[PDB]
Structure formats: C-alpha cells, structure tokens
A paper describes a structure:
N-methyl-D-aspartate receptors (NMDARs) belong to the family of ionotropic glutamate receptors (iGluRs) that are involved in the majority of fast excitatory neurotransmission. NMDARs form heterotetrameric ion channels composed of the obligatory [name] subunits and GluN2 (A-D) and/or GluN3 (A-B) subunits. All of the subunits contain an amino-terminal domain (ATD), a ligand-binding domain (LBD), a transmembrane domain (TMD), and a carboxyl-terminal domain (CTD), which interact with each other in defined manners to mediate functions including channel gating, allosteric modulation, and cellular signaling. More recently, a number of studies on intact tetrameric NMDARs showed that the subunits are arranged as a dimer of [name]-GluN2 heterodimers and that domains and subunits move in discrete patterns to control channel gating and allosteric modulation.
To understand the underlying factors that contribute to the different effects exhibited by IgG2 and IgG5, we sought to determine the binding site for IgG5. For this, we implemented single-particle cryo-EM on the intact [name]-[name] [name]-[name] complex and x-ray crystallography on the [name]-[name] ATD complexed to [name]. The cryo-EM structure of [name]-[name] [name]-[name] was obtained at resolutions ranging from 4.45 to 7.51 Å as estimated by Fourier shell correlation (FSC) curves. Although the overall quality of the cryo-EM density is inferior to that of [name]-[name] [name]-Fab2, it is sufficient to capture patterns of conformational alteration. The cryo-EM data for the [name]-[name] [name]-[name] in the presence of glycine and glutamate was classified into four 3D classes, where one corresponds to active, another is similar to nonactive, and the other two are similar to nonactive. This conformational pattern is similar to that of the [name]-[name] [name] with no antibodies bound, thus, is consistent with the observation that IgG5 does not mediate inhibition and instead has a small potentiating effect on the function of [name]-[name] NMDARs. Although both IgG2 and IgG5 bind the [name] ATD, they do so at distinct locations. Binding of [name] involves residues from CDR 1 and 3 of the light chain and CDR 2 and 3 of the heavy chain. e–f Surface presentation of residues interacting with Fab2 (white surface) and [name] (yellow surface) illustrating that there is no overlap between the binding sites.
Numbering used by the authors:
A (entry chain C): 711 to 812
B (entry chain D): 34 to 394, 403 to 509
C (entry chain C): 103 to 190, 204 to 558
D (entry chain N): 1 to 215
E (entry chain M): 3 to 133, 138 to 221
Write the structure that this text describes.
C-alpha cells in the first residue's frame, strides 16, 4: 500500500484498490474462490505454497517486486552481530533447508 | 434582566444598530436584554480599565460589547489578561483589535476572532483549488505562530489527491537590513506561481521593495497576506506591489450594526441556553476590586453554550482555541493604489468568485474539443474536492440549450485525460503556449449545412477556436 | 503575577528585570518582549543534568515529566543537548538515554509506568517536574521498590520541599544555586549592572526620553528597543555573589552553583560546578541503595518478550487443549511438533472483547526461535498481536502525528524487543528500526 | 442524557483493600473546570452527603481512604484501605442538562466473617393471646451474609404465605446482620398445635440453624 | 441548621404543603430546592427555586403536580404537592445549593410524606417471650400502625445496645414492625421488663410487660 502510494503511475486507480481493500488474507483467498475478487497481490512465499497445497488456485509466476524478510529489533541492542551470523550459521548447516523439509 | 453594556468607539450611527436588535422578538429568550449604550472617547486604556468597574457601578454588567479602533493590537494584548484576572466578558473586538491572540488562559473568555490564521490557510487551500497556481516557496520572518503553520501546511499538502507539492520554505528574520543581497541569492528558491508571505507590515514596506529590486517584481503582484497582516485597505502604500491577495476580515460587510446584531443577540440567547439546560445564571458584580475574590462562582460550564450556541440559522458556534469553526472571509484580490475590489464571497470554506478564469500580469489559444477514447477521455471531477487528479486536466463544458431566460455560460468543469492530451500538454511545455480548453456543443466533426459548418469546425469558422 | 506591570511596560517597550522568579513562562519573549532575567528560569537546571553525563559517564536515563510548559521546554532543552557528535567519540556509549515519558500533573499514584521502569533495568529514576507530588512519587516508589540499589536518585533545587524531605532517602543528590543573599548582594550587583547601563547610556548619542503621560499617549516611545540594546551591551565583570556576563537572551549565565547530597537527613555539600569545572568535594558519595560504590551504567539482562502475528505458512495456530496445554502431534518423520504455548490475543474471535487464549503455536517461527534460543542462551516470552495487522505510519489528524499503526508502533514504544514475521523491508521502517540480514528471499 | 452505570453495585470487598468502582456514563462531562461530575454518600439513618466535588479533590472531613479519577464517560473511583464503617449507598449520577438523572445506588459491602444466625423462637405471649389473634416470631441476630431462607414449622408443616420477612443493615458492633420473620395467625392455630420449629437457610453453612420447643 | 417538616399522611391524588426552615445564611443569595428519595432507593428532584423565589424548575412528572415557593426574608420554604401517586411515600429534603448553583453546600435530614391508601391507626404492640434462658431474646410485635414512624425502646428509654428494630412490612395497607432485645439469664425474668412504643404520627405510648409462661 505504501509502495503504491509512492508510485504516481499507480494513481491509475489506486482509489479502486482502496475501495476494495480487505482485512484478512484468507478472505481474499475465499473471494477469489467465490469469484468476487479477481486478483490478490501478495508475496510469493505464501502464495506459491498455499497454491501448491490447496488446488484450484494458480499464480501468474511473474515476480512483481524483489523482496526479502529480515528480523527487526529496536535500536542499540548489540545481539544483532551474533543474530545475523546465526542466520548465516543456520544457513551453513542447511538448517533453513531443514525448515523447508519440515 | 441581563446586564448588558454597549460601549462605543467609532463614527457610525448607533441608532442603525438599535433597530438591528429591536426588530427581533424578545419573547424567545424569557429574560429581557437590558442594554446600556454608552459612548467612549478614544482615551487612556487605564482609564478604560477604570471605566470597566465604573460601568459595573452603573449596573451589574454580566455581558459587554465595546466597539474598537482598527489599529489597536497592543491594547488587544492589554484587555485579555485583565479579563482573565477579573472578568468573563465578550467582544467582537473590532477591526485590528480582533487580532487572533490565542493565549492559553481559559479565564479570559473572549471570542476575539473570526477564523484562525490556520483557518485562513485552510481557505487559502480552497483558493489553491480555485486557481491551481502552485506553491513551491514560502517566505516568513520570526512571526510567532509560524512553526505550527508550516507543519499544518506540510501535513495537508502531504495528504493530497492532486499534483500540489511544496519545494521551499524560508525563515529569514529581517530587522537585520543587511540581508538584501541574501534575497538576491534567494531569488532561485522563490520561483513559484504562488508564494505565501507572513512578515511584519512595518518591515514589509522595506522588504517588498527589496524583493522588487531582487528581481521579483513580476511575482510581486502575486503575494499573499491576511488582512490582519496587511495594512489598512484604504490608501495602501505603493512599496507593496499592486493587486495583492486579501484573506481575512470584514468592515464593508457585516458591519457595526450587524456585528452587534451577532453580538448581544448571541449573548442573550447563550444566557437563555444556560437558562435552558440549567435554568440558572450566576449574578454579575459591581465591585471589581473586591469581587475578584468572589470568582468562586466561576465554575464556567457556561463556556459550552458560549462556544456552541447559534442564532436564527446563522452558524455561530465557536472554538475555545481561538477561532470560530464557521467561516465568513472576505474578497480574495485586494487592490492597492485604488480600493479593495469586491471579487469573492466565502461560505462553508468555499469561494464564490464569478470569473471561471483568473488572469495575472504567451497567449491563451482557445481550443474546442470532443470526447473520443482512447484519445480524449472526459470523466467527472473528484467529488471530495471538485477538481482533477495529478495526471488529469480540467475541461470546460456548458450546455445552454435548456437555458431560456439566462441563456449564457456558467460552465461546469470536467476532468480530462488520455493519449493526445499528454501530447498537447507536451506541446504546451515546449512552445510555452497557454490555452482555453473547452468542449463542443453540437456536432461531432459537424458537417456542411448549406455552406455552414457545425461541430468543432463551427468554432473555427466563427473564430471561437484557433486550435482544436 | 507581576504581568499587570510588565505588560504595561511592554506597551511602551520599557525593559523589566526579574530578580525573584525562575518561572519559564515569563521567558517567552514573543509575549514578554520587555522581560529580562537576572535570575535564570526553571529550565536552565535541566541542562546541568547533561553536565552530569560525564561524571561517571552515564549514558541511559528513564525520564518521566509531568505535562507542563516548563517540562516541555526542558524536553526541548535536553533534545537540543542530545543532538550532537555528528562525526565524521566512536565507542558510542554516549547519552542515548533510552526514554521520554509523559505524565498528567495533579493526578495520583495509579502509575504503572513505574513498573514499566522496572521492566527496563535502568539504574536511574532521575527527574520529575514537581516538588509537592514528588513525595507521592516517593510513596509510590517505595510501594513497589525503588529506594534500594539499582537506581540513582537526583534532584535540582526546585524539587525540594519538607514533604519531599520527609520521604527523600539519604543519598539523593540535589543541585542548588548560590542564591541566599540575592535579596541584598545580587540586588546591589543588578543595580551595578544598571549603573553600567546608564554609564553607557549617558555617553551615547541622541536618545529620546520615555516622556510624561501614560498609555493614553499611544505612540510607543521610540527609545524602548534603544534601552533594550543598551541593556544588551551591558557587561558586568564580577559582583559579590560572583558574576559572569549576560547570555544571548539576557540571562544570568551561572557557574555560581553548588551540589549537595542528602545524608543524615541533611544536605552536605558535595562539590561545585563552575562553568565547565565540575569540581567535587572531599566528601564521600552516599547513595540510598547502600553504595559508596559507583553504579555507572545500567544492568543489561532480559527475558526476551518477543511479539509475533499469526501468518501462514510461517505461523499457524490451533485454539487449545482441555488443560490449556497442547496435543503432542508428530511429523511425517515422527518428530514432535514442539509447539510453544503462544498465549494469544485478548479480544480474540475479533469483534468480541474476550480474553487471551493460550494457543498451539507452530510453523517456521517456533523452530527458528528454539534454534536462536539454544544459540544465544536466551530466556524469552511469547506475545501475540491483538490487532492482526502489520501497520502503516498513519498520520493521525490529532496534532499531525505520523505514528506507525499496529504492532510496529508497540515495538517502537518498546512493548516488545523484536518480532518474527514475514517482515517486509521498507525505507521508512529502517529510519526507526534496526534490521538484520534478510532471512527469506521472495517476490 | 448523562446516564451512568455503577459497577459493581452491592459489591463485597475484604478489609484494607482497593475498592474500585467503575462508573460508565452515556455521554462525556469533561471540561476545563477539571470535571463536571459530582458524587454522593449516605449511610442508612444518616443524612445524605456529598463525596466528590469534581475529582479526587474533596471538600472536607473525607478521610484519605478515597481517591477518585476518570474523565468523559469513565470514572474509576477507588477506596484505599477500606473498613466496615462506611459500607453504605452512594454515587448519585446527574446530567448537566436539566433532567438530573440521579440513582445508580452503589451499595458498599465488606467481606466480613460469615456467621450462623442466632435463632429466637417466639410463641404468642399472654397480652398477644387475650386479643383473639396471635403471632409467632423468628428473630435471627448474628449472621453474614443477609440472604436467609427463613421457614416456620408447626408440627413439621411449613407456613409460608403468612411470613413477613424484614432484615436490617450491617450491625457494626457484631459485624453481622439481623432478620425478622413474623407470622400472624389466629390463637387456636398456635394453641391446639404446639410444636414450634424454625429453619434459617444461611450462606455461612448449608444447614439451617434449627431450634425447637413446645408451647 | 436545616429542618424539613410539614409532611403527613395524604391520600393518592391529594395535596399538602411541605415546609422547611434553614439557618446559617441569607436566602436572597442562595438557591434552594426540594428533593425526593424514593423507598425503591432511587432519587428524584421535586423542585428547585431561585434566591428571590423567581426562576424555578419543575421536572416532567412534577409538571402537573407540584409547586415550589420560597420566602427570602423569613426562613421558610413551602411546597404545594397535589395529585400524588402511590410511590410518593418518599423522604423529602431541601439542600442548600452549591456555588455553581447545582450540587449542594450542606444537607438536612428531612421529613416523610406518606401517600398510601390507609388511615391513622394506633399500633397494636404485643410482647414476645418464649413459653435457654441463655441467648433467646425478648421481643415485641408492632402490628397494625399507620403511618411511619414508630420508635421502640425497652422499659426505660435507655436500652439501646443489643436492640434490633426491624423494618415495616405491609399487611392490609397497615405497617408492621418487629423488635428484639438480647437478654442473658441475669435479667430473665428476675426484674421488670416491658416494651415502650411511641407512635408520634398517631401520638400513642404503648407499654407492654414481657412475662414468659414457661422456659
């Protein structure tokens, strides 16, 4: 929503997107299943997984925006130097891939 | 049974004020307005303070009105804390003494206002809606009341559905007469179609001539002041460049009969509203020195009906913060060598100007058009604001076929966008040509009728359109 | 209270000089144009706390101010003091003092903010902005516990009353002016300043008079700002009470200043501040928690109260079991789900103001946090967002407040230390929030 | 109007505690004169009195037990360490408009020690008996709390339609209550059948305190 | 300091004139009122009146019924109450209005106007003694009086401790009280003991001796 507010080219109707703004993502799933919502914009990490687990829903496949998920803390907590490295450390044994396999 | 003191400063007739209040039916109040029309020569304000509990000794006065001169703002700084020490009075005030003094002691109990300076900025936004000549620079000195001003203006302009964006704000305190070459350097940051200006008018007769010698004389006619910040509207000095913008307050309007008609009637109905939900009123006093110990009865929940009570459909609710929530501004273009010229009437923070077009001081080529997607798409305007969006331009439509008595324009505006619209906008960016965009009435590309052409060809054979 | 005189002097711009007041409301020269100060306002002692900042090199406060114009001016003063070291020392345990909190004056001790200070492990209580309800502050402080160790207790000269002296513990530090003989000595010093002012004035050029006849002669008396510039040019070398010349706003500009400590229920003088010279006395440092130690810095331990929001596939929730526990469920490999409790949102089943329910909480989140808690050896706590939203920086129309909506405003206010979520990375978030490396890559 | 709810009314709180009462108005009453809202106190038998001018600011004579605050529609009115001599009814509501909607009635109870009621069995006396009518009377004077089911028994048969129940407030010297049950009947209905029994189902214990004798 | 009187027993739909005498201040600088405290424990305003007996307010149920009046020199308030209902057995007060003119400044205990469908009757008071000796009280039944109030003491006017006077119950529109005094074995009977009942509304004094038959 902030991304589309930043784009003047998305002022081609942003107000329509405000008129059909939702609250729950599962309601955006159901309204597509009820054929009311024509399209829902979301991150691929949720969309492809729920589409591959619950059928009759397909993605476009096209990546609209490049993005990632970090972890945020408040200012000046010094644990980050070991936290991010632990994110690297869980990357080194493939513990991330253990999360994927589970 | 209402102790009302009517005090006079000025030259207008008070008898024309008398029938302004003597014409209303007094049976709606169930308590008699006992007014006291006293005159007052322009004299010592300490003697006015003496006169206050002189007229308290004349009658137990609960409500006052006092006409005032138009150049007394230091006395407006005087009167309020005297009240907050001692009284709960009410004035318009009058003229320049009605300056927006937003001091924080709630025991002053004055409604010294109309709209606020920030409310004057709010209706200045409707002026910005009217002309669409952008604000890219804002100029001010240390005039106390500017930080909240620029913060409110930034907070409004960041929440727009339009292409209105600010680029510059300027704080330069210029008692400091050495900084004229600083404004010569600051010519680059004052290149806006419309610039806000908030300075001292005593300094501004020097400052505006300095800015004219900077190179800003062509924009010198396009500067904004409120009428409180502005000098006296009669015989304005010419160091200010002519044809400026007037904002705030009125004397050629609701006047000295009409202000007291707001006045005492507002007071008496507010007291009757205290007689309506509480059926009571505390007694006024007569011993100002010693009754200042007797302000224990001033648990003033009466301030609710001070700020809220209207009269006879005229919206007369107020804010306790130092303004009235209901607007009546004045004409928007002041003229300088000659007098004020009546152009704009204000209501519900909305302007009535009978122009549909605004000039200033290379040519507006009149252009008729016709809707055809995907080239010319004509849509309605934003109903929250009545105007067009960022990528959209207004277009002028009027149908006068159903008009039989007043068969004349009065164009509605519509929004217009599309493919060739951006093309002609690019042409207007390149060759710097202004225009008069308007619509067609009869005929798409109207054919030849016995030689005569209707449609857009009719405008070019009658020379109403040079381009189309 | 002398404003009926001074504002009439402001009608003619004749100066007026305060000798007995530190009321900072009179320091508003946009209204009190005629006012000048031989006595500095209430706010000027607040800056002295910044000169406390290098005593034992303290760097972290919790500050609660009663809502007053003087307190807000002190807030502006300390914000002016803190915004420094734009370089280019680089060991930056400097005064990033952690907190500012508001309080409604005149109210009573229903403050849970004291417990919120208890949650932050700070070694400070330092400042409030009253002197009469400060005894009630002491009562509420001794109610839970604040009088012991792990807290430093400091006041200024206008925090001192007998009721506060009935409940200030021995060890609290006061900062007082040298202002007892001001009724005689600084009176003579101030009229010596006006003696220098008239010695400049009589050897000055053509200057009009403030003539006979009052406010009825409504023209303002041109020599007013002339007298103001005459007083701007006055420079007194030294007086009986000690004198440093005026400030840019016509202030007293001290360095005639002392520090006392409450011990044996009396203010034994511990040192003198002189301009920059913090010169301590030979006396011992008594603190009410049993010191004569130097408890500089604050203790840094934690139970990591992390917040989270339910979002599949990263977070899944199940309501509960019958005991409030979770059902032992196995994977496809027979491994347990290892679901943490995840005491959920109050007013759950949204629209109904119910209570919180302990969940069955699973997904990537619980495995990641178990891995991190076994990595860093961190005890923790689970919290769930009752709002159900990430949040935007909504501009609140009340006084133009761009506040981050939802849980992001909570961790901005320190309701949690961190967050695990599908955390979208934006520029506006990074100006306020620390971020780690991107744990996930998507589009 | 300014219509308010007082929760909990008839609330029983143990001694020395924070007895906080939530007051939930319909509309707001806050202003710059520190409030509009004003409150009340009376004991039964004692004249009505005021308790709160506008806020925790009190008038005179009120002890430091009370501390009241709140704004708009909400008023949290706490009583710090509470005792058993102010357990009574208070908290008038009102509107600043002319219909001053009074009432609410926050009765204060203290969680005192429970007690089993001392039962007094009264047959008609001699001067009661010469008039033609007669009356048997149950009295219960030592019990907490006040909700007693009082049943009268002649030869085991219960009479309920002539039971006149009337109980009183907290007897403070015994920290308990007092209840009466009057049954007014004829003479021969109490003389020909002589087995006087009363039961008083209390909330201290589940069993009624029985007392039985013969005329 | 403040005393309300002029009540009595009025029929439903009837009229009377309530009155008040207040001492402590001049009346022409202070508003005055009339207050209603219903036996269902909700309050009401009867009326209010200006310092000079001028601007008044009558509520909605009041505005067909009641009329306030005030002498500002002689300390007298009068209240003509016409067309009463069954619920007008309330306690009626006056209070000494606030400095804002609304709340109160102090209070007065107030009288009672009884509006029921009964007539004045003397109380048929009969003693109550069993026919222990350790804890069983000695009582009296105040049956068949109208209207309120009735004061009950025991044989001297000074026996107040251990005295439980129970509220009135209605029976054929006639009120009925119960009363008990605790007696140990040292005063049963071994002495004289009577119940002394004073009915000021019927202006009777009933003295009934308590003699038991058996124990």
């Amino acid at each position: 929503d902030i991304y589309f507010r930043r784009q003047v080219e998305l002022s081609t109707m942003y107000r329509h997107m405000e008129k059909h703004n939702y609250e729950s993502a599962a309601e955006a799933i159901q309204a597509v299943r009820d054929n009311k919502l024509h399209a829902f914009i979301w991150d691929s990490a949720v969309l492809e997984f729920e589409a591959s687990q619950k059928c009759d829903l397909v993605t476009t496949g096209e990546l609209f925006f490049r993005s990632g998920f970090g972890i945020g803390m408040r200012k000046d907590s010094p644990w980050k130097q070991q936290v991010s490295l632990s994110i690297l450390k869980s990357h080194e044994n493939g513990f991330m891939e253990d999360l994927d396999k589970t | 049974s209402i102790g009302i003191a009517v005090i006079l400063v000025g030259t207008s007739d008070e008898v024309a004020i008398k029938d302004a209040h003597e014409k209303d039916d007094f049976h709606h109040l169930s308590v008699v307005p006992r007014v006291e029309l006293v005159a007052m020569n322009e004299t010592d304000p300490k003697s006015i303070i003496t006169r206050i509990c002189d007229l308290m000794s004349d009658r137990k006065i609960q409500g006052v009105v006092f006409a005032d001169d138009t150049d007394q703002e230091a006395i407006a700084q005087i009167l309020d804390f005297i009240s907050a020490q001692t009284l709960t009075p009410i004035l318009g005030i009058h003229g320049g003494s009605s300056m927006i003094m937003a001091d924080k002691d709630e025991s002053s109990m004055f409604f010294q206002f109309g709209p606020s300076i920030e409310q004057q900025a709010s209706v200045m936004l409707n002026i910005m809606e009217e002309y669409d000549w952008y604000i890219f620079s804002i100029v001010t000195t240390y005039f106390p009341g500017y930080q909240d001003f620029v913060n409110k203006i930034r907070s409004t302009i960041e929440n727009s559905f339009v292409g209105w964006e600010l680029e510059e704000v300027l704080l330069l305190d210029m008692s400091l007469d050495d900084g004229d070459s600083k404004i010569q350097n600051q010519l680059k940051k004052l290149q806006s179609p419309i610039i806000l200006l908030y300075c001292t008018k005593e300094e501004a007769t020097y400052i505006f001539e300095v800015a004219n010698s900077v190179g800003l004389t062509g924009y010198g006619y396009t500067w904004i002041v409120p009428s409180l910040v502005a000098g006296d509207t009669d015989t304005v000095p010419s160091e200010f460049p002519t044809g400026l913008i007037s904002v705030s307050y009125d004397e050629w309007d609701y006047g000295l009969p009409a202000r007291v008609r707001d006045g005492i009637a507002i007071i008496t109905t507010a007291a009757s509203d205290m007689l309506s939900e509480h059926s009571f009123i505390p007694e006024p006093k007569s011993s100002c020195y010693n009754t200042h110990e007797k302000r224990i009865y001033q648990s003033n929940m009466l301030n609710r009906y001070l700020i809220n009570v209207t009269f006879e459909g005229r919206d007369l609710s107020f804010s306790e913060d130092g303004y009235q929530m209901h607007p009546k501004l004045v004409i928007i273009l002041l003229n300088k060598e000659r007098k004020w010229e009546r152009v704009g009437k204000w209501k519900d923070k909305s302007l009535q100007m009978k122009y549909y077009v605004w000039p200033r001081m290379d040519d507006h080529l009149s252009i008729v058009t016709l809707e055809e997607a995907p080239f010319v798409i004509v849509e309605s305007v934003d109903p929250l604001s009545g105007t067009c969006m960022r990528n959209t331009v207004p277009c002028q439509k009027r149908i006068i076929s159903e008009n039989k008595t007043d068969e004349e324009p009065g164009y509605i505006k519509k929004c217009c966008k599309g493919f060739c619209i951006d093309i002609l906008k690019k042409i207007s960016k390149s060759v710097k040509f202004t225009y008069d965009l308007y619509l067609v009435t009869n005929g798409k590309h109207g054919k030849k009728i016995n030689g005569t052409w209707n449609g857009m060809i009719g405008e070019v054979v009658m020379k109403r359109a040079y381009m189309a | 209270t002398p404003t009926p005189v001074s504002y009439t002097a402001g009608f003619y711009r004749i100066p007026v000089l305060g000798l007995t007041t530190r009321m900072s409301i009179y320091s508003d020269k946009s209204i009190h144009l005629s006012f000048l100060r031989t006595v500095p306002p209430y706010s000027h002692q607040s800056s002295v706390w910044f000169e406390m900042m290098r005593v034992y090199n303290w760097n972290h406060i919790i500050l609660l101010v009663s809502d007053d114009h003087e307190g807000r001016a002190a807030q502006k003063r300390l914000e002016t003091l803190l915004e420094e070291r734009e370089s280019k020392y680089d060991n930056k345990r400097g005064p990033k003092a952690e907190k500012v909190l508001q309080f409604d004056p005149g109210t009573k001790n229903v403050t849970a903010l004291l417990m919120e200070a208890r949650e932050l492990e700070a070694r400070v209580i330092i400042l409030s902005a009253s002197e009469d309800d400060a005894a009630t502050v002491y009562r509420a402080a001794a109610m839970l516990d604040m009088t012991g160790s792990g807290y430093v207790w400091l006041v200024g000269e206008r925090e001192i009353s007998g009721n506060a002296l009935r409940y200030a513990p021995d060890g609290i530090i006061g900062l007082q002016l040298i202002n007892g003989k001001n009724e005689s000595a600084h009176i003579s010093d101030a009229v010596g300043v006006v003696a220098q002012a008239v010695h400049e004035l009589l050897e000055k050029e053509n200057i009009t008079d403030p003539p006979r006849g009052c406010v009825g002669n409504t023209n303002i008396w041109k020599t007013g700002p002339l007298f103001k510039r005459v007083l701007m040019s006055s420079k007194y070398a030294d007086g009986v009470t000690g004198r440093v010349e005026f400030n840019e706003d016509g202030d007293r500009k001290f360095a005639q200043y002392s520090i006392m400590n409450l011990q044996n229920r009396k203010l034994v003088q511990v040192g003198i501040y002189n301009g920059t010279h913090v010169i301590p006395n030979d006396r011992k440092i008594i603190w009410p928690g049993g010191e004569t130690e130097k408890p500089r810095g604050y203790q840094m331990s934690t139970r990591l109260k992390i917040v989270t929001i339910h979002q599949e596939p990263f977070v899944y929730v199940k309501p509960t079991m019958s005991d409030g526990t979770c059902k032992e469920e196995f994977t496809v490999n027979g491994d347990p789900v290892k679901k943490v409790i995840c005491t959920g949102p109050n007013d759950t089943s949204p629209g109904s103001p119910r209570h919180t329910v302990p969940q069955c909480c699973y997904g990537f989140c619980i495995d990641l946090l178990i891995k991190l808690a076994r990595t860093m050896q961190f005890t923790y706590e689970v919290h769930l967002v009752a709002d159900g939203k990430f949040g935007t920086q909504e501009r609140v129309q009340n006084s133009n407040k761009k506040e981050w909506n939802g849980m992001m405003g909570e961790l901005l206010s320190g309701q949690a230390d961190m967050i695990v979520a599908p955390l979208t990375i934006n520029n506006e978030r990074a100006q306020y929030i620390e971020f780690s490396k991107p744990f996930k890559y998507q589009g | 109007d300014i219509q308010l709810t007082q929760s909990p009314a008839s609330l029983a709180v143990s001694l020395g505690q924070r007895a906080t009462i939530s007051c939930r108005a319909s509309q707001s009453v806050s202003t710059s004169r520190y409030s509009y809202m004003h409150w009340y106190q009376h004991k039964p038998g004692q004249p009505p009195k005021l308790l709160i001018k506008y806020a925790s600011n009190l008038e005179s004579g009120v002890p430091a037990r009370f501390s009241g605050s709140g704004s708009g529609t909400d008023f949290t009115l706490n009583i710090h360490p509470v005792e058993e001599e102010d357990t009574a009814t208070y908290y008038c509501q009102h509107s600043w408009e002319n219909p001053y909607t009074f009432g609410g009635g926050t009765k204060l109870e203290i969680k005192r020690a429970d007690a089993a009621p001392t039962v007094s069995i009264f047959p008609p006396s001699s001067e009661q008996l010469t008039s033609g009518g007669a009356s048997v009377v149950c009295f219960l004077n030592n019990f907490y709390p006040k909700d007693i089911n009082v049943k009268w028994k002649i030869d085991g048969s219960e009479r309920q339609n002539g039971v006149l129940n009337s109980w009183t407030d907290q007897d403070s010297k015994d920290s308990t209550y007092s209840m009466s049950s009057t049954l007014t009947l004829t003479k021969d209905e109490y003389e020909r059948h002589n087995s006087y029994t009363c039961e008083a189902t209390h909330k201290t214990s589940t069993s009624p305190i029985v007392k039985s004798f013969n005329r | 300091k403040l005393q309300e009187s002029g009540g009595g027993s009025v029929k439903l739909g009837g009229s009377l004139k309530l009155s008040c005498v207040v001492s402590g201040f001049t009346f022409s600088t202070y508003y005055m009122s009339w207050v209603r405290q219903t036996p269902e424990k909700r309050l009401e305003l009867v009326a209010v009146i200006n310092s000079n007996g001028g601007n008044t307010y009558y509520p909605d149920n009041v505005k067909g019924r009641f009329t306030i009046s005030r002498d500002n020199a002689e300390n007298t308030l009068y209240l003509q109450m016409s067309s009463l209902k069954s619920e007008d057995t309330a306690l009626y007060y006056c209070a000494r209005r606030d400095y804002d003119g609304f709340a109160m400044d102090y209070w007065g205990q107030g009288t009672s106007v009884t509006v029921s469908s009964a007539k004045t009757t003397p109380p048929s008071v009969y003693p109550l003694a069993p026919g222990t000796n350790s804890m069983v009280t000695l009582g009296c039944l105040v049956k068949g009086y109208f209207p309120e109030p009735v004061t009950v003491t025991w044989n001297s006017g000074s026996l107040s401790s251990g005295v439980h006077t129970f509220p009135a119950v209605l029976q054929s529109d006639l009120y009925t009280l119960s009363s008990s005094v605790t007696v140990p074995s040292s005063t049963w009977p071994s002495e004289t003991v009577t119940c002394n009942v004073a009915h000021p509304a019927s202006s009777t004094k009933v003295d009934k001796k308590i003699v038991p038959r058996d124990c």
